[PDB]
Amino acid sequence: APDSVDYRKKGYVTPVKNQGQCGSCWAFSSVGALEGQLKKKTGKLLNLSPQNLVDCVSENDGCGGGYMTNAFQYVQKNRGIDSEDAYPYVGQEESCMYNPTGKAAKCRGYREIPEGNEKALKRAVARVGPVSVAIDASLTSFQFYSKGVYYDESCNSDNLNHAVLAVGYGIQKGNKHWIIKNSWGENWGNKGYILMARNKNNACGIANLASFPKM
Numbered sequence: 267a268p269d270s271v272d273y274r275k276k277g278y279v280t281p282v283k284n285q286g287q288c289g290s291c292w293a294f295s296s297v298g299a300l301e302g303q304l305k306k307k308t309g310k311l312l313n314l315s316p317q318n319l320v321d322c323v324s325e326n327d328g329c330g331g332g333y334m335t336n337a338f339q340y341v342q343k344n345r346g347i348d349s350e351d352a353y354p355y356v357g358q359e360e361s362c363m364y365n366p367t368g369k370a371a372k373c374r375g376y377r378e379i380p381e382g383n384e385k386a387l388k389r390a391v392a393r394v395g396p397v398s399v400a401i402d403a404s405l406t407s408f409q410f411y412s413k414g415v416y417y418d419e420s421c422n423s424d425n426l427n428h429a430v431l432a433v434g435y436g437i438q439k440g441n442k443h444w445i446i447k448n449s450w451g452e453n454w455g456n457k458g459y460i461l462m463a464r465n466k467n468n469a470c471g472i473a474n475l476a477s478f479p480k481m
């Protein structure tokens with residue numbers, strides 16, 4: 267696999283979104299994974315509906331947390347997911363209002379990456395596209411990230427509290443990393459992004475819960 271790849275430069279990633287005061291991290295992370303696959307298979311790049319997921323996946327808790335896999339399976343069974351336009355983001359749980367007329371994509375299941383395996387995670391990013399991952403983002407260092415390849419020895423790999431999206435990987439001054447897309451707005455980190463340490467004993471549980479939709 268390439269020693270470096272940036273899906274943002276491939277046109278696989280939509281603009282940075284902002285979840286606001288709702289624990290919809292999982293939804294945004296799932297939508298991001300679906301978005302990349304939609305781009306790869308059809309060549310079209312549009313914003314999907316995280317709100318569709320927040321309101322409709324009964325296995326997740328909406329603004330109270332959830333898992334990407336549940337969101338993916340929901341999309342398989344539901345046979346689709348609305349476009350951002352047909353189901354805009356409001357940042358609050360409400361009744362499932364899925365509109366079939368607005369369906370912009372669907373998926374046929376998902377695949378999980380071997381837990382703890384970063385090598386497995388890299389190979390997937392290289393040949394599949396962006397991958398939904400869960401990390402520990404509870405540290406003040408993280409919240410205040412701004413430059414360089416992020417790392418903090420206090421980061422717990424067993425405290426997976428924020429689902430994010432892995433849009434690539436590379437190396438910055440002899441420092442391998444993952445190109446991470448966040449949903450805390452464009453004014454957070456580096457344009458809503460963060461470079462996190464790669465191949466450094468699973469920094470923040472980066473490879474503990476990685477998965478991706480299949481189309």
Ligand SMILES: *[C@@](=O)([N][N]C(=O)[C]([C][C]([C])[C])[N]C(=O)O[C]C1=[C][C]=[C][C]=[C]1)C1=[C]SC([C]([C][C]([C])[C])[N]C(=O)O[C]C2=[C][C]=[C][C]=[C]2)=N1
Pocket residue numbers: 284285286287288289290291292327330331332333334400426427428429449450451454
């Ligand atoms: C995230 O939205 N919520 N966490 C989860 O969904 C977790 C982790 C991943 C997704 C697996 N899921 C989980 O635990 O599984 C099911 C479950 C749920 C509950 C209990 C047990 C099990 C998340 C991360 S950060 C965040 C906040 C919300 C908060 C109201 C403040 N959003 C936020 O900070 O956004 C705005 C913002 C913008 C700029 C700067 C700072 C903040 N929610």
